[PDB]
Design a protein around this ligand. Sequence first.
Ligand code: HEM
Ligand code: HEM
Ligand code: FES
Ligand code: FES
Lengths: 359, 359
Amino acid sequence: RKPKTGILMLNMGGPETLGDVHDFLLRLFLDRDLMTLPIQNKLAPAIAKRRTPKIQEQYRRIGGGSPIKIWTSKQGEGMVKLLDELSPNTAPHKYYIGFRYVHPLTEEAIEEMERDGLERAIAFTQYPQYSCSTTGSSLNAIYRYYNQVGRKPTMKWSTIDRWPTHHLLIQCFADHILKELDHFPLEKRSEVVILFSAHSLPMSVVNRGDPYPQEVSATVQKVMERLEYCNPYRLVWQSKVGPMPWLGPQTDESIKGLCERGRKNILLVPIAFTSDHIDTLYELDIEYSQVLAKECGVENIRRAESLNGNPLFSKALADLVHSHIQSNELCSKQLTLSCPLCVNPVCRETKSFFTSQQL
Amino acid sequence: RKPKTGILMLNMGGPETLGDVHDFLLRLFLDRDLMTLPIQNKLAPAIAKRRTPKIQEQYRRIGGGSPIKIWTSKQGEGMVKLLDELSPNTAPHKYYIGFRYVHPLTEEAIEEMERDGLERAIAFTQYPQYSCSTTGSSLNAIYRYYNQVGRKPTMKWSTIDRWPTHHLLIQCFADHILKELDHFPLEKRSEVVILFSAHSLPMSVVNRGDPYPQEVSATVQKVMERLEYCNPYRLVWQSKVGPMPWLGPQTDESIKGLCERGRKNILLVPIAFTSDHIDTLYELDIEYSQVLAKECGVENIRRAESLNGNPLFSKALADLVHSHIQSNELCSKQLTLSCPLCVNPVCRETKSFFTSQQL
Ligand code: HEM
Ligand code: HEM
Ligand code: FES
Ligand code: FES
């Protein structure tokens, strides 16, 4: 029985195998909507060469690749099963994975979608919190795909472009936190501080007007109310590649900060991502939770399990898609505004792609 | 009857006259809690005496003073009128004003509270979103008082140190946003961009783990939630004195930037303050809403009214105090945790003054 509604799940991606690291690093240092224009164009190729081996060693220490595709397919199969029951009018649903820097690419997903002859396609970013660097880049890749091929879509397009507060996402984060709190010694629980950590962004992207840190802040507050403020917390930010100023505090200087201050029981929370990856399994778990925490004299540092297979997350995906269908919306009202200081002619075109189709 | 419960309302304050300007900038600048520009001290009276008449000119542009004290007294009064009726067991309530930089100073209201022989004293920041530089500074002044004067307090103390998402607070904003909305030309109402505007912070303070920017973002999320996301929005940052990097985008820069990109219908919401003042009356109404504005070819730019004498806002302050009383909480859970990069030795003892008091 033929598919009617296709759900395009977007995330930058990750190299599934060690061999993949190279073009992942290349497609990414090429992506204009993510980063700065330093005669790049063909400067990325050099960088991909140098860094591949180093990054590769990083992926080596976590089973040799990212688990994103595994997780994404799991989440999507669950979502599809719920939606075939909850929304029979749109009854045959299909998901499609669309990665921005690894296979199956955004570009390869849309081509399989057009081939399937859908009545409907939805661009469902898997980033709950919006950045022009993240959701922006994936949505641009859709407009451009149809620019490149030179023909309007053969199906109605819409996007669920953000969801920083969906209540089930919030239930999921709060459940995973209670159950980790449960492993701290009963006498170390109440002093546990909850450190919410998200991927940072260059201050140049922040000062542009980028909506991401306001939205991430919205997720955090919403999880803390649901936790009834049981523990103190702080939102801090992980990564900061480069020379450039990024928004802080950094997650790393915060852990070392807390320790040097008699705060030694810390619960790390990956709050901007929906599954495991190099940021969580390498950067946070190995590296900050093992190497740095040892040097600091941490008594206990735990990491809230990522959502990954939590069935309640599938229920969250389905509920987003269904509410999105019933509301007949084209995109959030936030997508209709660009950053006050946007210097990107494509943003306004992606937006027009969703607001002004024909269906 | 004799006052039983005292509500110490804390605010930074502002000069009620031109005569008061120089005294205000002196203390403002002599405040290590606020800035570590006391790089060399007595460089404070240097800048005070310096900039006094420039600032005096600003104040003349709006009536000859800051209205902060008139509005706080009126708020203080509706609040007391409400608490007597709604919490009769905490007898007659009385409000005291504790400005950081002008009369009445925090020290002056304490010495009165001490004399009034109250049963209970409540330190009630008038900043919804906590920052170490505002409320933290103001709480530290209470702890410094007692230290200075070298005796234990004669009354039981607690603090309401933050309230960024209180439901009545949010309704005031959504109500004010809505009424300013109706005043735009009808066929433009849906293209208005809502620019929420808070005092910025040095990157040095944000990057140290100041909680403010996270909380501010929480206040914005709730407002838009109650508005059902009826217009698109951004959260930007105003004021900003000096040459080191602060938290942007900047209001002015974003207003400008929007107008050049086609978005010439703008509503300002001063989201981090409850009263009209220099930042609202001069920096926003004039310089943003006139000079820079009509100069960019703004079609319409309005500003939602300050909370001021809204009767719903007094109800918010009494509601917070009532709940505080029934909670028996000494301070928010947040307060019990210092910035992870806190360097101010005062912070820790101000914690214990509220948590570990000897009455
Ligand atoms: C414009 C700002 C951004 C820049 C410059 C950037 C850049 C990069 C780069 C170069 C890598 C490769 C890993 C490395 O070289 O260390 C990476 C990895 C990663 N980034 Fe970002 N990114 C940005 C925004 C974001 C945001 C907002 C998120 C939010 C979730 C994010 C999530 C991730 C994840 C999950 C990985 C690891 C992927 C895997 O396991 O395969 N990025 N980023
Ligand atoms: C540590 C970071 C901060 C610094 C260094 C700072 C510095 C200053 C300075 C020097 C002024 C006077 C401007 C002038 O003389 O023209 C000022 C004004 C003001 N600030 Fe800040 N500020 C900080 C954070 C904040 C925050 C977070 C708030 C509340 C959201 C705030 C509320 C105000 C208000 C209401 C004024 C108006 C002053 C007046 O009424 O004359 N400040 N700030
Ligand atoms: S950079 Fe945000 S809309 Fe273009
Ligand atoms: S500077 Fe925030 S706890 Fe001291």
